[PDB]
Amino acid sequence: MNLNATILGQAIAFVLFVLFAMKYVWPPLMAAIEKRQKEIADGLASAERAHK
Amino acid sequence: MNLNATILGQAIAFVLFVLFAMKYVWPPLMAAIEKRQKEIADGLASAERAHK
Amino acid sequence: ENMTPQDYIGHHLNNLQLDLRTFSLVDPQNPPATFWTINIDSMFFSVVLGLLFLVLFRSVAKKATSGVPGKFQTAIELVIGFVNGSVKDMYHGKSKLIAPLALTIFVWVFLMNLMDLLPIDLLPYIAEHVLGLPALRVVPSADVNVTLSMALGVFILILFYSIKMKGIGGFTKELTLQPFNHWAFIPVNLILEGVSLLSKPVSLGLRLFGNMYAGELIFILIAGLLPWWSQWILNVPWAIFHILIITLQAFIFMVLTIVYLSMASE
Amino acid sequence: TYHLDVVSAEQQMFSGLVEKIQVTGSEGELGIYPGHAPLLTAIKPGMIRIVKQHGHEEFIYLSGGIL
Amino acid sequence: NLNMDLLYMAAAVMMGLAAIGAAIGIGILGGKFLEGAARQPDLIPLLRTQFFIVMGLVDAIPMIAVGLGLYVMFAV
Amino acid sequence: NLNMDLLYMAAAVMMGLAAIGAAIGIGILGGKFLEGAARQPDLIPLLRTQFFIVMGLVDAIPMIAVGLGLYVMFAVA
Amino acid sequence: NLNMDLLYMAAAVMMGLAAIGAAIGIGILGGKFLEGAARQPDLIPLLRTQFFIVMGLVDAIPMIAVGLGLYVMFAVA
Amino acid sequence: NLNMDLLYMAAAVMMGLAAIGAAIGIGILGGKFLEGAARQPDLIPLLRTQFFIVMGLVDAIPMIAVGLGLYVMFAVA
Amino acid sequence: NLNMDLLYMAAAVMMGLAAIGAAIGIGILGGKFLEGAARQPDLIPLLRTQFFIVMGLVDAIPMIAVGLGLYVMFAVA
Amino acid sequence: NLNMDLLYMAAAVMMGLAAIGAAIGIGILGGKFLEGAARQPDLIPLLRTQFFIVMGLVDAIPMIAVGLGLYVMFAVA
Amino acid sequence: NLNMDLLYMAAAVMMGLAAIGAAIGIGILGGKFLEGAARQPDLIPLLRTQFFIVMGLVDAIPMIAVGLGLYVMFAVA
Amino acid sequence: NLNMDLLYMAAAVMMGLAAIGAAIGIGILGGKFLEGAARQPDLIPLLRTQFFIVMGLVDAIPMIAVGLGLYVMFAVA
Amino acid sequence: NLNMDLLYMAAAVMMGLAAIGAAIGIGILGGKFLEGAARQPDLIPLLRTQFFIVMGLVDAIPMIAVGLGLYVMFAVA
Amino acid sequence: NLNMDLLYMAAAVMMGLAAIGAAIGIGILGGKFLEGAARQPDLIPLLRTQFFIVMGLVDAIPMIAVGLGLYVMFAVA
């Protein structure tokens, strides 16, 4: 059997897999991190105005 | 499959990663989280006292 | 290359092992029978991933800004709050071990399992055509030894907490009275409450093993038994699905541990 | 949002626009979000939580009734 | 010789019982999912998420069995 | 020879169970699809969509078993 | 020889399991259909339509089982 | 000839299995019929109509099986 | 010897499954007959009628099986 | 000798299948009976009447199965 | 070998199926009993009497097979 | 000689089926117990009594079967 | 040799039946517990208690069986 | 060869029964989880934890079975 061809197919499959990953799975994580940042920023600023 | 002396070689690496994580990873992070939480809530307390 | 796929897969299912007694590497047809023959490749990646975990988390412990957190700090504190919420939902005692233990289990098992998503032949290609060593399979959690080491550790911890928090006078009480509560029945309960307590950790290990081991085997088969131009159409629908496994199989390993410890002490 | 009426035999008690509510129906607690399927039940004496759109939360005590 | 058909039967048992388990379990789960969706039709995207979560456990053991089945069917 | 006895027997037991799974598994589902439609039929096109979404998952393993049975019966003879 | 006897046995297993599946599936589906009409008679036009649409998928696999059972009994045996 | 006896096991299973399903498949269906009747007894014949429709589907595969269950034990035998 | 062993085993299954299908199939149906009766006892007789119409179908394919069992024991020896 | 020592298995199957069938069917029927009795207690004897009425139909087949099993055990084997 | 081990096997089969039937049937009945009792926290005796009646019916036919299993355990073997 | 192994087999069969029956019956019964408890949470000590009453009855035949399987495995084999 | 070979099948059937029974019973009981909790979130700590109580009974018989299975696999070997 | 083939069937039985048990149990439990989530969406988080608690009990014995099956299939091989 052509082992080099089996690695060929593995690489094709992995390229399609990383496509699916970086176009469905990652945006959720980045948006969650950004939501957390917005939350903490707004909390600290609203708490700042309370002092004045 | 093959029950192996590794059953011990892993447990060592286990109890180490637990302790350095305990004493030197978790309090450092949770202290900062609780600090930000308390010092956001203090602003709400200040607003309540301002109204009171 | 004279690989009949039936033998190619067999090679793929072999670990790389070492003789504790003789300090020698294992063979494709030859295994030192004595149990003292460490599985080496998983230890390297295992300890490697535990190192990477502790490194990545200390490197933010010593940078933690209590103001607006950096984008990198946010994710680590996110996972920290995730674990803390689960713990303080299921546990209520004053023990300081539970939370870091849970975090270690969660992230360590997650990174261990995540390995399988890598193409199956790549690192085995390197570790033979560069280092010359005979075999390599990389997923640490895909071996009974490591999951049973974790499971027996958790079992020792369960016994520790059950002794410490209600004493032998109560520990023997739970082990003899429940369920039927009369002394004439103590001999029967002593069986059940034993095997039950034994199944709790053992299944905990095997649950993690069986999922990952077969989860690796599929990829092996897909490599060994289909021509290149087709492999993807059966690799991809599995790989994405495995993302749903590696996460849950980590999460469950965390939660049940808490559920046991909180259940043991309280 | 959806329209919510709290009506007694004597006089009306609430007529705002709501985003969700929570009640203790005779068969258990129960939460109504928009688009909920048509449903009929009795509710036990106790509180009910209204959240008016823009998220304003308030509690109304009911001596029972039919939802 | 006499080995191959006996191994094929050992594989067929696994495949069949795995099909039984996966089909009946996901059928029950999906039935409850659909009676939930018909109740709160605006929360379909939320409940569906939970479904995909719990499905990941229902198909835990079947994909083990199926896997080993293929092994017995092709690797020995 | 003896093989062509059991090579069929297996193909049966695999594809028979694969039927019992696929049929009942969908029926339990389909029932809940109907009782929901029979209350507020205005959602029929909505629920039907979800129905197929989940039914594809039901036929995951049964059709795999049917494929292996066809391979055993025809290709393996 | 022994071949035809166990070929008949295999077809018998296949068709018994297929019958179990088709029967119980269509039974559980029809039970809910017969409930829907009662709640809202006058849409029977419609629930029966959807019931056939679902019955086709319920029977998809048992039909293959019966097809291959006959294929064995009267082409291979 | 051993060929003489195995057929009786191939039939007895089929007409057994087709019996378990075709019974229960109807036993379920008829159930939802009766509790439908007990609610709207003015519609009993109308529901009966649909019942006799749906039952005609439930008995589809079983009547095939029992058919061959005879064919094996009498025509093949 | 064995020629006259198997035909008794072939009966054990045929009347065994035929019992189960008959026992469960009615055990389900009569249950609803009770429920609809308990909600409205003033309606008992009409339900009691419809029941026997449905029941007679359920016991159709089981009873014949049991018959073919007795035959297979006595007249088929 | 095997020609008699093996028929005990036919008897065991023949009557154990009837055991499970009768037990589970009567369990379902009696459960519906008990719920009827619980909802409207001043109805009990009439529901008891109907319960025995159709319980007879439930145990009809298992009884012949058990009788034939006992006959095969004592008289035949 | 062929004499006694098969008798032990037949006794095992009888008693295992008897356990299945009795346990599941009485579980169903007792579940309905506890439901009715929780709905009527004053009719516990009035309902448990009926429960004992119908359960005395249910357990009986498994007990036939259990007694015969003991017979085959210690009177055939 | 080989005689003894099928005694392990018979014990395995009987004990596995007894476990099936006991576990599923107690599952159903305890599920209904918890359903009752959730509604009338103050009546838990009463229902917990009645539960235990029936609790021992479902697992009578399973207990017998497990006892006799221990007999077969450790006393006979 | 079979005294060595067949014991793994003997253990296999015990472990499979223990698995099915424990899983199904605990699933039913836990499902009823989850729905009771969803209907009464404040009673979560109370009902959970009863759960682990009644589950402690359900898990009794299977852990016998599985235990003996291990003994058959490694002790008697 | 002569001795090391049956072992694969022995393991197959373990894994098949464990698959049925785990799958159907977790489905029965998740169905009630989704029903609860549908009645009160805001409790989704809390109920979810109570799921992973109870579910951790469901698949214990099935995973013991799967582990020992993989052992037999790769340690004894």
Author numbering:
A (entry chain Y), B (entry chain X): 1 to 52
C (entry chain a): 4 to 269
D (entry chain H): 3 to 69
E (entry chain R): 3 to 78
F (entry chain M), G (entry chain J), H (entry chain L), I (entry chain Q), J (entry chain I), K (entry chain P), ...: 3 to 79
Cite, word for word, the article reporting this structure.
A key component in the generation of cellular metabolic energy is the F1Fo ATP synthase, a biological rotary motor that converts the proton motive force (pmf) to adenosine tri-phosphate (ATP) in both oxidative phosphorylation and photophosphorylation. The enzyme is comprised of two rotary motors, termed F1 and Fo, that are coupled together by two stalks: a central “rotor” stalk and a peripheral “stator” stalk. The Fo motor spans the membrane and converts the potential energy from the pmf into mechanical rotation of the central rotor that, in turn, drives conformational changes in the catalytic F1 motor subunits to generate ATP from ADP and inorganic phosphate (Pi). Here we have used cryo-Electron Microscopy (cryo-EM) on detergent-solubilized cysteine free E. coli ATP synthase13 to probe its structure and understand its rotational dynamics and coupling.
